[PDB]
Structure 1
Amino acid sequence: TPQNITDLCAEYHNTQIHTLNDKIFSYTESLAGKREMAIITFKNGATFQVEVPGSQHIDSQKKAIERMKDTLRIAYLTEAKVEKLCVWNNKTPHAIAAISMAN
C-alpha cells in the first residue's frame, strides 16, 4: 500500500498531482442524461471533473465515484482546504482520481 497521494498517484500511467492548499470555489452537480457528473473550481480557474461512470470503470471503481462526489460536496460546503489532487491529465477537464485533505 501507497501510504500517500503522491505514492498512490505514482502507480498510474496518465496521472498528475495538483497542489492546491485552498478550498473549492464552486461545485456543479449534473443529473442530465449522460452528464451525471460533478465539476469543481478553484479561485485560480482550476476546474476538475469527477467522471461520468462508464463500463471502463470496474465494480469497485464505480461506488467509490459516488463517494468522491459525496466528499467534494461536504468539502465545498464546509469550506475545506484541499491540499492536493491526483488526476488523469488525459482528459479535459482533468479527472480526479484521489484527494488529500489537511489543515
Structure 2
Amino acid sequence: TPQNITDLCAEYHNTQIYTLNDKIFSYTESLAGKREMAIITFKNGAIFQVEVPGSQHIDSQKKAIERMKDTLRIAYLTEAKVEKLCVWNNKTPHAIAAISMAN
C-alpha cells in the first residue's frame, strides 16, 4: 500500500502529479446528460475534471467518485489549500484520480 499521493499515482499508467499548493479558484457542476461534469480551476490557469462512473470504472469506484465530488465542493467552499492532484493525462481536462490537502 502506498503511503502518499505521489507513490499512489505512480502505480498507474497515464497519470501524473500536479503540485498546486493553492485554494480552488472556481467550481463548476453539471447535472446535464451523461457526463455530469465537475470542473475545478486554479488561479494559475490549471483546469481539472472528475469523470462520471462509466464503462471504464470497476464497482468500488462509484462511491469514491461521488466522494471526490463532495470533497472538491467543500474544499472550494472552505478555501482549503490543495497540495497535489494525481490526474489521468489521457483525458482533457485531465481527470482527477486523487487529491491531497495540506496547510
Question: What TM-score comes out, normalization by structure 1 length?
Answer: 0.97
Deviations 1:31-62 (A, max 9, x none): 00113121000011100000022021111011
Post-superposition offset of 1:102: 0.5
Paired with 1:56 and 1:15, the residues of 2 have a C-alpha distance of 15
Identity across the alignment (%): 98
Structure 2 gap ranges (5+):
none
Could you list the runs of 4 or more consecutive aligned residues of structure 1 that deviate by over 2 angstroms after TM superposition?
A: none
**SS of 1:48 mapped into structure 2:** strand
Question: What TM-score comes out, normalization by structure 2 length?
Answer: 0.97
Paired with 2:27 and 2:86, the residues of 1 have a C-alpha distance of 18
Post-superposition offset of 1:2: 0.1
Structure 1 gap ranges (5+):
none
Considering only aligned residues, what root-mean-square deviation do their CA atoms show, in Å?
Answer: 0.7
